[PDB]
Design a protein around this ligand. Structure first.
Ligand code: HEM
Ligand SMILES: O[C@H](C[C@H]1c2c(F)cccc2-c2cncn21)C1CCCCC1
Length: 371
């Protein structure tokens, strides 16, 4: 891989994300790292409006720019949702709204917290000399004490990182088809199947670090957007940048590039046909970092791995390809069970539209098998 901002150790996630901003922005960093206290004490929204308007120009690097996106993205969800009990702000104050908006446009991302903010850039190792495992890692920002945002964000990230092992194999696959190296391609496909199988065990960590009640009744609220949302029917007003209200989707792992890229690699056309599911995953590419959505584009313009394997009448190649697809079905099926426990059952003591989305996506993946 190249300038697509993909790391051989960490994948689509951002290696060594920046923890501190320049001292120009302590009024921002102060609010973001005390979100639990300021929300509970009802002091958050006033401290948003007591801020003055800071320029973007002192955010020099890519890392500081993305950390500043994480900082302002969190404050925005906190300001808009408050303590998450239904009273919402519809006007985002200018002294935070235009710095957020100008920064979002420099990074080609929408002015709302996305996956690449709160997962791919929201982490750090405790001891930098020990490995990437849950016990040596922490998030940088949370919303409320007990919101399980750390468990939820880190376990996502750990799955993203398990998938990095398979991403570095992708160039091997295409070179092998181009150079007509069937044994090379067979081994490459088995290697990708093996990685997707290992990423399944990483999902099991979710049960030890997230509990359904807190996730459903707290974290979910701070991840909500203002598109198709009854509470903000027309969107949100970004003071002093636009005057119209604007609607942007809440956080979704449909914004994760790692499952989209394996759908594209294998020729599982998740974005084909005029269904809501295909529509939503295409729209969510606008909420990916431009470098990552460029990488999905260049995979799509390479010749299809699926029809290469079909064109050959090769049981070995067909079995290896189906191994990868079976492993994707396994992840989405385990993930579907997670959603039953963490959304469907809590909601019972909406969710059906979410299950139906995942089931459409799993059903498409299942239909891509050969034998
Ligand atoms: C408490 C744990 C989790 C819950 C309740 C949950 C729930 C959901 C829901 C409701 C969706 C619907 C689409 C959307 O709005 O994003 C979704 C999609 C998705 N989730 Fe999760 N999720 C959880 C954990 C994870 C983890 C750890 C990953 C690791 C990467 C992950 C990966 C995905 C992906 C890739 C999608 C897009 C659909 C697909 O490609 O199959 N999820 N999830
Ligand atoms: O699935 C998204 C949340 C999303 C998400 C983030 F917004 C941030 C970090 C990880 C994830 C995630 C992982 N799987 C789904 N999602 C929400 C949809 C509405 C119900 C609550 C979950």
């Amino acid at each position: 891989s190249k300038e697509y901002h993909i790391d051989e150790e960490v994948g689509f996630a951002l290696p060594n994300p920046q923890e501190n901003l320049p001292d120009f922005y302590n009024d921002w960093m102060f609010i973001a790292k005390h979100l639990p206290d300021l929300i509970e004490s009802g002091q958050l929204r006033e401290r948003v409006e007591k801020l003055n308007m800071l320029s973007i120009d002192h955010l020099t690097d890519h890392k500081s720019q993305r950390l500043a996106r994480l900082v302002l993205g969190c404050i925005t969800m906190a300001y808009v949702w408050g303590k998450g009990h239904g009273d919402v702000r519809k006007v985002l104050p200018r002294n935070i709204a235009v710095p957020y908006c100008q920064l979002s446009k420099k990074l080609e991302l929408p002015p709302i917290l996305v996956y690449a903010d709160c997962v791919l850039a929201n982490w750090k190792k405790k001891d930098p000399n020990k490995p990437l495992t849950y016990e040596n890692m922490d998030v940088l920002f949370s919303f409320r004490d007990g919101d399980c945002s750390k468990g939820f964000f880190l376990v996502s990230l750990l799955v993203e990182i398990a998938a990095a092992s398979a991403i570095k194999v992708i160039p091997t696959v295409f070179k092998a088809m181009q150079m007509q190296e069937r044994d090379t391609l067979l081994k490459a496909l088995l290697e990708i199947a093996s990685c997707l199988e290992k990423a399944l065990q990483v999902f099991h960590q979710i049960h030890d670090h997230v509990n359904p009640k807190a996730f459903f009744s707290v974290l979910r609220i701070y991840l909500s957007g203002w598109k198709g949302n009854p509470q903000l029917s027309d969107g949100l007003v970004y003071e002093g940048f636009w005057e119209d209200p604007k609607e942007f989707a809440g956080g979704s792992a449909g914004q994760s590039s790692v499952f989209q890229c394996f759908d594209v690699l294998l020729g599982i056309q998740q974005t084909a046909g005029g269904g809501h599911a295909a529509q939503f995953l295409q729209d969510m590419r606008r909420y990916m970092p431009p470098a990552h959505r460029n990488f999905l584009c260049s995979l799509e313009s390479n010749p299809s791995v699926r029809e290469f394997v079909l064109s050959k009448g090769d049981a070995g190649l067909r079995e290896a390809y189906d191994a990868c697809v079976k492993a994707l079905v396994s992840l989405r099926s385990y993930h579907l069970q997670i959603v039953t426990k963490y959304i469907l059952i809590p909601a019972s003591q909406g969710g059906t539209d979410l299950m139906n989305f995942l089931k459409t996506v799993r059903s498409t993946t299942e239909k891509s098998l050969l034998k």
